[model samples]
Target: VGSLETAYKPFLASSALVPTTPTAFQNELKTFRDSLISSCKKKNILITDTSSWLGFQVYSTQAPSVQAASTLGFELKAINSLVNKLAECGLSKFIKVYRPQLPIETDQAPWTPMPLEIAFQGDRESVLKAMNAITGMQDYLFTVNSIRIRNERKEQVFVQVSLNLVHFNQPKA
Candidate 1:
């Protein structure tokens, strides 16, 4: 038998003590999925998936031209607009927008920072598990920059997973 592709829809409907029925859970999942798609589409973006622990990823199709200084300004404005929109929707905690690297010929392309990974308040194991699940793909490369704990009511920590794009698919000589 072939494995079926399934979407991992994560959401908590109600805090009621009574165990939620399967029907209720499925209904909530569908509603949440619809809301995500609708909201993203309104902003000219598409929602790919989301993590209950982390956040959502948007579909990025086009790359910005970074050859000219004016182009860089336009790119920054576009990114900031999306960031502000997400923050307005109360998703300021861990929002990420994917921007493909500039062409090697561009002067400032080499100075760009690696994509940042933000994992909010969670235990060590769970945090790592989430990070591995997201960045384990062969297409992606990451390295931990630092790990530190914060004294929330209960202890929590964050990990900075830096994307190593230069070595992303380099052939082993």
Candidate 2:
């Protein structure tokens, strides 16, 4: 009654933007799911839909660090080691780590700033591997400074990272 575990694989991106129209978006979403299902079935792997499970969705203000845990969720403490760990998880197919595009609307104070969010697809084991990589790297503690969760059906979770250490500024330094 249970599915067998196999190597984790990333679901490829299918579109530039998710359409707002119900019929169109639903079709696109189904297409994406079908792709994953077909790939898993071929590899004899079981897929888990973790879009419901709460997670550390991180956003970076600059090039994300492989070593530091900033706003980009949890940072990997041992970056070199983390690379090996990801390799074990089947992410070795990608040589250069993907960097998300930065948002341009940070200028207007009225608009909500967009943060980068990385969502990995696999079973619970894969999720745990990613989380451990982040927790192991966290050295300093940081607060969100501000947060706003859009109450939408779509995966609207957001995690923002601040770069300026202004809060740490002091007269001594």
In candidate 2, residue 173 scores what lDDT? Answer: 10
Off by over 4 Å in 1: 1-63, 66-119, 123-125, 149-151, 167-173
TM-scores for all candidates? 0.32, 0.25
For candidate 2, the per-residue lDDT at 130 reads 47
RMSD of each: 16.9, 18.1
Task: Give the CA lDDT, 0 to 100, for residue 52 in model 2.
Answer: 12
Tens-digit per-residue lDDT, 35-107, candidate 1: 5456556644433344221121221122322333232332233333323333233221332334443343142
Best by lDDT: 1
Worst lDDT run of 10 residues, candidate 1, spans 7-16
Position 118, candidate 2: lDDT: 34
Over 4 Å off, model 2: 1-19, 49-173
* C-alpha lDDT of candidate 1 relative to the true structure: 0.34
TM-score of 2: 0.25
Each prediction's Cα lDDT score?
Answer: 0.34, 0.29
**What does candidate 2's lDDT look like per residue over 1-173, in tens digits?**
11111110110111112223333333333444455445545554433443211111122113333322232221221222233343344321121222233332122321122222233434445445544553343322222333232222423322222211111111111
Report how far residue 135 has shifted in candidate 2, in Å: 15
